[PDB]
Amino acid sequence: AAEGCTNQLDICFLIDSSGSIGIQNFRLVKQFLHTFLMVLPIGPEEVNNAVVTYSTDVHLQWDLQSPNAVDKQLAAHAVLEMPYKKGSTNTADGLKACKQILFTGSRPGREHVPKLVIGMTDGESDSDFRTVRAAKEIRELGGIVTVLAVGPLYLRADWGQLATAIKPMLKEVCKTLPQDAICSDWSAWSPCGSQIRTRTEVSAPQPGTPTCPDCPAPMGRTCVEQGGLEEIREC
Ligand SMILES: *[C@H]1O[C@H](CO)[C@@H](O)[C@H](O)[C@@H]1O
């Protein structure tokens, strides 16, 4: 929301690879994703990323349960290796893929973390990124859908100025995302047996903006959810 946003995200990058993009513009998208992943706090406890390419059919590059989902350097290298497969623009099936990954394919702990779809497309499917039932379903499940059309959660950029869209895209997403509770720092370890330290919830979690009329938004982590208010060590 305002004042900030959570670090625990699941992001499915949905990349158009149609013939209306071309092998040239596809390389720009990959390099855009390369530097984009460089800015995101990619990590097992932070942001998890999945990448899906599509044209006539859907091509899963890697999902959230892959080692690339939690390693920044590993993931950044991989998006550059992504093969260009020409065809039509089957965004519908692509969104169904991101839906499957985000809501059924999470890492063991992260089923209820905020779900985010970042789609990149051209003049096509910009209105079908809202119209298609798959995108509607992601929204009513609490998921967030962002689209970058090249050539508020809808952004426009030209092929020569793609990277200029990164900062404003992060800006809009952070407003839609919830802010976790703000906890105090841990107290010193208590004397023994077993050592125990505590902390306080200074500010309450702030929910994010609903993605559609009257549909659920993530409520953000309480301090109890962010690792509890107490920790116990043994001596
Ligand atoms: C308590 O736990 C550790 C202590 O080193 C840190 O992650 C942090 O200071 C937290 O408040």
Nearest 5°: the CA angle 94, 19, 95 is 10
Top mutation candidate among 46, 186, 190, 200 for ligand 1, by most atoms within 8 Å of CB: 186
Cα 33 to the center of its chain, rounded Å:
13
Closest CA to 209 of 200, 201, 218: 218
- The HSE-up count of residue 82 (CA atoms within 13 Å, CB side) is 33
Give residue limits of the domains in the chain.
1-179, 180-235
Ligand 1 within 6 A of CB of 188: no
**Residue having the nearest C-alpha atom to atom 4 of ligand 1:** 186
**Residue having the nearest C-alpha atom to atom 9 of ligand 1:** 185
Resolution to 1 decimal place, in Å = 2.6
Rounded to whole angstroms, how far apart are CA atoms 138 and 117? 9
> For 28, phi and psi rounded to 5 degrees?
-70, -40
Ligand 1 within 6 A of CB of 189: no
- The HSE-up count of residue 5 (CA atoms within 13 Å, CB side) is 21
**Residue having the nearest C-alpha atom to atom 11 of ligand 1:** 185
Nearest atom in ligand 1 to 197's CA = 1
Q: Are 52 and 58 in contact (CB under 8 A)?
A: yes
> For 215, phi and psi rounded to 5 degrees?
-110, 145
DSSP class of 211: S
Collapsed DSSP state (helix, strand, coil) of residue 115: strand
